[PDB]
Design a protein around this ligand. Structure first.
Ligand SMILES: [Co+2]
Length: 453
């Protein structure tokens, strides 16, 4: 297919002070954008089976007075170092086993204890230096919380200055362990433990003012299958729609169980935003009908001539009545959307109007548009370019902004005909280009990135 290059290895690592810039990047952009994703899809004659298995590479876009610098290095995880030095896959990935959890932290990046960390879904992040992109090593937590599975989608409370996440202890007495990390510590405080027979794959979760909401899609594993089966991690998970989806609501200041509520079965990788209003919670999710999208992101499908087989996801607003009752939803947009982002700093946990994402609607091609959904005016704005495949749109608010959509969108875009990627900068209000920075190579299709001031 045309986008095949986005799922092919990038072996080139370089450090460049200036990229060729078209347009003008506002003077006030003084921070660094870090992109994480897979960038090596084979090790000698052995191939990684899934998109999620590729060995983590970081991309650094640092903004100084209208100019932009770029650096990219592979994360020197034990997974990477072992593959490089033995030419054997040596750690168990999401969907590939070799012929000890992987530290292939290829999903996201954040800061814990004032240190930059790469994250996957195994228990421990991997610390890296933002200046050099060199790997420091395993970032240990300083606590007794047991876990075998977690998210690379921590929430952050700006008022209390706390990271919030959960970790699942997978055993014959499995538990969802909801925790927080105060600034300037790597000690996790256990907020609450919810016991569970068959843990669900919950890639992300919802946070409100007072709550963590775990949305437990009925895509679940038998602990003993995970311990004993010869099969890669994700193959041990089963779709059981007869369970329905369970919404688990935990007070995230005192760990009190607010309640559990059930809707009809659905699956999701990514939450958009959630908020309390009266005695109700609204949870906005990028929802699929079932878990089949997981099998659709195997590389042989992504690289193949049947990509219209890849199921679409849409923004569903679930309404949880705390007073009690079945959880119903409505669609916020008819657009197929993935990789959702918001004005997180100002609107996470709050009523809001604007979602940014990639279009998966297949009007003209696979994942070829950026979209901005106006939830209020049930409308959308679109960016696209012949033979271009744009990555996750990262919002950056402007200084002393008075509006939710006053700022910039940053997206790593693959130009398939040019066989090279560019950073695209849109004004968030108009959703039109203000600048782009050329990169001398292709940036493989990634997952998540964050802007650090
Ligand atoms: Co994700």
């Amino acid at each position: 297919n045309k986008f095949q290059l986005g799922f092919s290895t990038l072996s080139e690592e370089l450090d460049l002070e200036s990229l060729q810039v078209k347009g003008t990047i506002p003077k006030w952009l003084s921070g660094t954008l870090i992109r994480n994703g897979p960038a090596k899809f084979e090790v000698g004659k052995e191939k990684f089976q899934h998109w999620f298995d590729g060995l983590a590479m970081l991309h650094k876009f640092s903004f100084k007075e209208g100019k932009v610098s770029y650096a990219n290095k592979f994360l020197e995880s034990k997974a990477y170092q072992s593959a490089r030095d033995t030419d054997k896959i040596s750690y168990r990935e999401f969907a590939t086993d070799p012929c000890k959890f992987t530290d292939n932290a290829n999903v996201n990046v954040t800061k814990i204890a004032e240190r930059f960390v790469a994250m996957t879904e195994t228990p421990l992040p991997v610390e890296f230096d933002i200046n050099t992109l060199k790997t420091v090593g395993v970032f240990a937590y300083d606590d007794k919380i047991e876990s075998g599975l977690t998210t690379a989608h921590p929430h952050y409370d700006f008022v209390k200055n706390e990271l919030v996440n959960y970790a699942t202890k997978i055993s014959r007495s499995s538990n969802y362990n909801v925790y927080k990390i105060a600034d300037k510590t790597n000690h996790r405080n256990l907020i609450g433990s919810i016991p569970v027979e068959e843990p669900a794959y919950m890639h992300s979760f919802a946070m409100t003012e007072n709550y963590v909401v775990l949305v437990e899609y009925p895509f679940v594993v038998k602990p003993l299958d995970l311990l004993l089966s010869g099969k890669p991690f994700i193959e041990n998970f089963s779709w059981k729609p007869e369970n329905g989806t369970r919404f688990i609501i935990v007070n995230r200041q005192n760990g009190n169980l607010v309640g559990t509520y059930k809707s009809d079965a659905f699956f999701a990788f990514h939450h958009v935003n959630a908020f309390e209003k009266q005695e109700e919670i609204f949870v906005d999710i990028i929802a699929y009908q079932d878990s089949s999208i997981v099998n659709a992101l195997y590389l042989d499908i992504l690289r193949g001539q049947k990509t219209d087989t890849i199921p679409t996801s849409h923004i569903r607003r679930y309404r949880i009545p705390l007073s009690g009752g079945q959880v119903e939803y409505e669609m916020l947009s008819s657009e197929a959307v993935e990789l959702p982002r918001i004005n997180y700093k100002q609107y996470n946990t709050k009523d809001y109007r604007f979602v940014y994402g990639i279009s998966t609607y297949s009007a003209s091609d696979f994942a070829n548009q950026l979209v901005k959904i106006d939830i209020l005016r049930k409308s959308s704005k679109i960016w696209s370019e012949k033979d271009c495949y744009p990555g996750e749109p990262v919002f950056v608010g402007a200084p002393d902004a008075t509006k939710e959509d006053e700022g910039l969108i940053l997206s790593a875009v693959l130009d398939a005909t040019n066989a090279k990627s560019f950073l695209l900068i849109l004004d968030a209000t108009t959703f039109e280009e203000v600048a782009r920075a050329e990169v001398p190579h292709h940036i493989p299709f990634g997952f998540h990135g964050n802007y650090f001031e």
